[PDB]
Nucleic acid binder design. Structure first.
Lengths: 207, 79, 130, 122, 82, 155
RNA sequence: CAGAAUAAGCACCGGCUAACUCUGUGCCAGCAGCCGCGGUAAUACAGAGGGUGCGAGCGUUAAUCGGAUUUACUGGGCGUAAAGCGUGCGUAGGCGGCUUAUUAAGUCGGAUGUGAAAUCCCCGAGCUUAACUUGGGAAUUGCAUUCGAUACUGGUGAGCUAG
RNA sequence: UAGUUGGUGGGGUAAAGGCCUACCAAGGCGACGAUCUGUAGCGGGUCUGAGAGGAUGAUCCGCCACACUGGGACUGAGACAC
């Protein structure tokens, strides 16, 4: 199962832009109701929260951008705790290693939902083979190319020109002419945005 | 190459048979204190040399009777 | 009646330190002298002396105070006559994460747990000192 | 205790009794309704609460609460009972499952329907 | 008698055999004397297809063990390969 | 200077013709790098009690020597009927403790530790026991100085 | 090849515990794991709006361990909270002063044999991924035999006087 | 506890053995729990627990026992035989 429904109330509850829309218009012009919770009893951002509320609200925000549900997220945490290293760093590496996210960051999809649809509809090839699972883990030195029938899609060309506005990350090199790209290694924490706090998730799941 | 036990005789009434008491010291599995345990073993003594109170050695052998499977080797100390 | 002379010696040292005496004296024995020698070598006490009148032997120990507190802040008897404690070479206890010493009697004499691990032997655990 | 005392006599554990003996370690039981009636709550509560004395296949006769507002139970009905105390009613340690065998689901209910056993309205 | 044969394991439609020396009266996937190799009829990629301990095989044959047809064919093929 | 409010309770005193209600507050202040203290305050209103408790906490302070972000060695402490056990942990563990211990430990600047309460869980007594244990924790340099040895000799 | 075309529910929103208002009823109907709600403004009953948590599942009941240091070996107590026999003597048992020689039972160390496979853990391999299957290790904290050590406990011989 | 505990002669078994038999003797077990009585297939393992422990013995593997209820033997290398 994948979440379907309204994305702007989703972002409004967390109070921050979750990048769930293409971005042709800024978030503030898009919703006009930011810093207001979706409910009628919705209030400003300054509402006091308990620690349990803060940890939960952070984990939900982390889940909502990547579109992962609770079972898979708990499995991700349990694997990251087993793997040696920083638990939050490992969890971020696992979340950023999914095939759909790599397709999105390579610029073949306007949004992560578009990337998921493209991957699921067998429009992507991994190392020369057409796959259809969004949660396939991408390893170092991989090659992701757009399938031949998938090429010449107006949505894909719009996605690549939109991605041109943002910056192509370091670990991904893309030939946009050939619709091809190469994942090299998992981003370190510095590459990812620093507003995300992972410690809250850590004690929330280690309670 | 044969299993031997050393003990003290506690009975000699039976004909060609003696009863020897074996003692061992082990640790209690849970509380750790050293405990002493005792076992009474019937042995074969053909010539009735042993008597009550001597220290004897016995060795494992084939069955001789219903309850005897050990045979006397030597008398270490006399009473 | 008195049945644990080592425990008596440790209790005497503890009470003397708590009362802030300078020296402590007791009837002597070779085991007590051996334990006091280890304590002096490790630096918890200053001087160990033995006197002999005719057959009685008296053991005297000079105590150490640094700043206001006594040097020996904790001394515990581990093995006791009602429960003997024996440890292998790989299960020797550590006291205060290595900042204290466990006194161990091994087949090569009385030493600390550190020296016992260095020599790769076990034995009886007499006391913890810190 | 001393070590010798522990060796001679070890520590003793006291067994625990279940709070639902009539179920005999089963999730539910089936019974035949012996007497349906109403009772009054213990202080400081005041109401008229619907209960029924039921004889179970376990060989026991107990009392069970009826939840929800409006029931069609009567003499000799066959019902399923589960665990759960009513607190303010002394002696009633069981509940009747709504809509299982002869009991029917409550009417005109649209929230918490899985409890009380009401189907989805069309 | 004593035989050398295949015991089945693995998953449905993907068999994986252990090569075992055992008394013939024992159940196929039960009690055995000694395991001396494995066979994977559907190996792919880097997976090995057949490991057999030739010295143990010869030692047990010298004592009167009877290989099955499949095991004899596999032993011949392994000897041919190496 | 980080400040934490552990508990707030309402108390009553009986007089003729009614009762007088008051409020008590327990707070813990710290610098996050080995300085920590705690205090109590009583008032008619909650903010006044919090202010008095904070002032008392700032007045009652000690210095705690840490090993990086964790304890030097296991600690057992007690105050009245409350007993506490604290143990050092490796990096990435976090602070595994109850709220009363968590406040004091985080104010004192410990990042990885495992802690356990036994006996009574009264907040003031637990804070007292944890404070005593942190005060009485020792260090290799102090041990070497007191025994007249070297740090490498002490190990 | 066809065309969004065939495909979302369940629990909860006084505190413990993330998520609030309005109508209907008035110690009635009813809710309730504990503390407790309802006797005309019910954020706790029923409906509705809104929201929160999960999601092809969601809730309830039953059962085991945990939290429970609440049988306490690790790791509890007995003046007043539960708990010192009314007071002695004494059998089995438990424990026992100092020095010395010897023994090697307890205790410690080495070697050898054994401790089936599967299972748990680690590094890999094959399943589009994962579950799953599988190669090799580590482990199996034990037992037995044999060779060594003698500080402590035990046995034996001798000696001493603080009990 | 009176074939009960030990011994001798004899019988019997694939094989040691009161396994059986005739005599001789009075031994044997027990507070380290005999006898009686309730409950129960055992292990590798599984669940939980920081650990020590506690609960458990479906599915997989090893051992044991049973085949409507009791008592027997035959054939056979092997059964007291679903």
């Amino acid at each position: 199962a994948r979440y379907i429904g309204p994305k702007c109330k989703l972002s409004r509850r967390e109070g921050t832009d979750l990048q769930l829309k293409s971005g042709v218009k800024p978030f503030d012009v898009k919703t006009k109701k930011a810093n207001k919770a979706p409910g009628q009893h919705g209030q400003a951002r300054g509402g006091k929260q308990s620690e349990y509320s803060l940890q939960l609200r952070e984990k939900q925000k982390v889940r909502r951008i990547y579109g992962v549900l609770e079972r898979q997220f708990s499995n991700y945490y349990k694997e990251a705790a087993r793997v040696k290293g920083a638990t939050g760093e490992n969890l971020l590496k696992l979340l950023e290693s999914r095939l759909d996210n790599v397709v999105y960051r390579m610029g073949f999809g306007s949004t992560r939902a578009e990337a998921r649809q493209l991957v699921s509809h067998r429009s992507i090839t991994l190392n020369g083979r057409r796959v259809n699972i969004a949660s396939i883990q991408v390893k170092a030195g991989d090659v992701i190319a757009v399938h031949e029938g998938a090429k010449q899609q107006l949505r894909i060309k719009n996605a690549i020109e939109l991605a041109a506005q943002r910056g192509i990350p370091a670990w991904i090199e893309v030939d946009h002419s050939k619709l091809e790209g190469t994942f090299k290694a998992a981003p370190d924490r510095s590459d990812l945005p620093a507003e995300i706090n992972e410690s809250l998730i850590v004690e929330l799941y280690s309670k | 190459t044969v299993r031997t036990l050393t003990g003290k005789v506690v009975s000699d009434k039976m004909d060609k048979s003696i009863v020897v008491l074996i003692e061992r010291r082990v640790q209690h599995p849970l509380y750790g204190k050293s405990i002493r345990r005792s076992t009474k073993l019937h042995a074969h003594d053909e010539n009735n040399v042993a008597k009550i109170g001597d220290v004897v050695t016995i060795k494992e052998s084939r069955p001789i009777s219903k309850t005897k499977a050990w045979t006397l080797v030597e008398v270490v100390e006399a009473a | 009646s008195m049945q644990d002379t080592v425990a008596d010696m440790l209790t005497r040292v503890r009470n003397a330190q708590m009362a802030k005496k300078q020296t402590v004296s007791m009837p002597s024995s070779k085991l007590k002298v051996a334990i006091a020698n280890v304590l002096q070598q490790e630096g918890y006490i200053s001087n160990v002396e033995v006197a002999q009148e005719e057959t009685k032997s008296t053991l005297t120990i000079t105590l150490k105070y640094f700043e206001g507190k006594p040097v020996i802040e904790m001394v515990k008897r581990v093995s006791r006559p009602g429960l003997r404690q024996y440890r292998g070479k790989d299960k020797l206890p550590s006291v205060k994460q290595g900042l204290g010493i466990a006194i161990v009697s091994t087949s090569k004499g009385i030493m600390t747990d550190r020296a016992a691990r260095a020599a790769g032997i076990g034995g009886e655990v007499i006391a913890f000192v810190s | 205790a001393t070590t010798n005392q522990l060796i001679r006599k070890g520590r003793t554990t006291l067994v625990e009794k279940s709070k639902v003996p009539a179920l005999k370690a089963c999730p539910q039981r089936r019974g035949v309704c012996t007497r349906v009636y109403t009772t009054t709550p213990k202080k400081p509560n005041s109401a008229m609460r619907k209960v029924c004395r039921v004889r179970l296949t376990s060989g026991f006769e107990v009392s069970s609460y009826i939840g929800g507002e409006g029931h069609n139970l009567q003499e000799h009905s066959v019902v399923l009972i589960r665990g759960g105390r009513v607190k303010d009613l002394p002696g009633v340690r069981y509940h009747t499952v709504r809509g299982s065998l002869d009991c029917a689901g409550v009417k005109d209910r649209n929230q918490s329907r899985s409890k009380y056993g009401a189907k989805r309205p069309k | 008698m004593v035989v050398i044969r295949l015991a089945r394991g693995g998953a449905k439609k993907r068999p994986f055999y252990q090569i075992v020396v055992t008394d013939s009266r024992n159940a196929r996937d039960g009690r055995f004397i000694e395991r001396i190799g494995f066979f994977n009829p559907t190996a792919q990629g880097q997976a090995e297809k057949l490991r057999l301990d030739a010295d143990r095989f010869a030692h047990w044959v010298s004592q009167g063990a009877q290989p099955s047809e499949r095991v004899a064919s596999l032993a011949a093929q392994a000897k041919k390969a190496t | 200077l980080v400040e934490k409010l552990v508990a707030v309770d309402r108390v009553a005193k009986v007089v003729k013709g009614g009762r007088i209600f008051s409020f008590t507050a327990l707070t813990v202040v710290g610098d996050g790098n080995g300085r920590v203290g705690f205090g109590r305050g009583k008032a008619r209103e909650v903010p006044a009690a919090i202010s008095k408790a904070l002032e008392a906490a700032r007045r009652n302070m000690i210095t705690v020597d840490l090993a990086g972000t964790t304890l030097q060695h296991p600690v057992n402490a007690r105050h009245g009927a409350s007993r506490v056990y604290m143990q050092p942990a490796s990096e990435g563990t976090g602070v595994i403790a109850g709220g009363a211990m968590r406040a004091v430990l985080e104010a004192a600047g410990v990042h990885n530790v495992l802690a356990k309460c036994y006996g009574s869980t009264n907040a003031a007594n637990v804070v007292n026991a944890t404070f005593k244990g942190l005060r009485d924790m020792t260090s290799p340099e102090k041990v070497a100085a007191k025994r007249g040895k070297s740090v490498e000799e002490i190990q």
